[PDB]
RNA sequence: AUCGCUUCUCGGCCGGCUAAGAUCAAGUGUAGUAUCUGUUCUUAUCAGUUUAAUAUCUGAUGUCCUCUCGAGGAC
């Protein structure tokens, strides 16, 4: 469970945001939000690395309470 | 005092300065490096770092044309040279090598100078424009 | 087909390169912790690591 | 309505001539540091030096006998 995606975000949230938002439920160690290139815009979605398991299943629970910009965040196990 | 081994720093700005300011300008490209005249670009050009320049190992008919031609006109390289193709230091030291190793109110006011349209079988009286 | 005769026998019967890099950072070395399934760890960073860690 | 060609219209990517006109700036030394580039250790084990720990450096490849590195026997 170490790692989840996080769907439906916008691109004025960055790594940072993440960092702290998902560190306010437990802390993130590897923090992975692309950054797309070509049009040099974020299409938000993302992964998340943890200390190990417990934290992540207790993230599965807590979790998907997070909302970005108005909207929804998806959060779930990988 | 000028002269001295030359630097890849030094080299590739001269790429970087032929490519911008073109071939003929030396003077120019001169002026940006340090330690290096104009003659000692421009040589440094041709003679090595052109990339017309044919870096590689000589074929075998490269080595019978040389050694002929050698043979024809002994220690002239600058005529050889651009027969074979080659920079003359490089065939000479190939050819060293080969037996080496063989052995005012004009605009504001008033309309500049007026041409009312001509009037055509028709009727522009009526016409007038809204403001904006 | 010896082996299908025995997994029909033994089944349920109802189916649910870096070479002196990591000598000078310090991994790829024997190391043990005991309290941690007498786990092995390949390098001093990663044990010192091992003292944060769920498990 | 479709295909092809054409016309118009719109949108998105989207520096003259001369003798080339003429001419062309670099101090030194004593110490010392930093930053670039290139190249080298899959070595196995043990003993010692050494290190905060590494690292590094320094030494050799169970013993005996027989036969032609291999085989057998005794430990």
């Known amino acids: 469970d170490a790692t989840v995606y996080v769907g439906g975000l916008d691109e004025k949230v960055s790594e940072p945001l993440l960092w702290e938002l998902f560190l306010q439920a437990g802390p993130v160690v590897n923090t992975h939000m692309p950054k797309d290139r070509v049009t040099g815009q974020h299409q938000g979605y993302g992964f998340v690395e943890f200390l190990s398991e417990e934290d992540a299943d207790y993230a599965i629970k807590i979790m998907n309470m997070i909302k970005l910009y108005g909207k929804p965040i998806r959060v779930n196990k990988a | ?132 | 087909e010896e082996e299908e005769q025995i997994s029909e026998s033994e089944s349920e019967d109802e189916e649910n390169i870096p070479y002196w890099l990591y000598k000078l950072h310090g991994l790829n070395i024997n190391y043990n912790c005991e309290i941690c399934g007498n786990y092995t760890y390949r390098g001093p960073k990663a044990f010192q690591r091992h003292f944060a860690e769920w498990r």
């Open chain 2, 1 to 132: 005092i000028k002269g001295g081994v030359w630097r890849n720093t030094e080299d590739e700005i001269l790429k970087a300065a032929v490519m911008k300011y073109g071939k003929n300008q030396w003077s120019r490209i001169a002026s940006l490096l340090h330690r290096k005249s104009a003659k000692q670009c421009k040589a440094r050009w041709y003679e090595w770092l052109d990339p017309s320049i044919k870096k590689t190992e000589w074929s075998r008919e490269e080595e019978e044309k040389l050694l002929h031609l050698a043979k024809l006109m002994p220690t002239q390289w600058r005529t050889i040279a651009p027969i074979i193709g080659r920079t003359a230091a490089q065939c000479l030291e190939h050819y060293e090598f080969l037996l080496d190793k063989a052995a005012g109110v004009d605009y504001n006011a008033e309309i500049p100078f007026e041409k009312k349209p001509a009037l055509g079988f028709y009727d522009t009286s009526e016409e007038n424009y809204q403001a904006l």
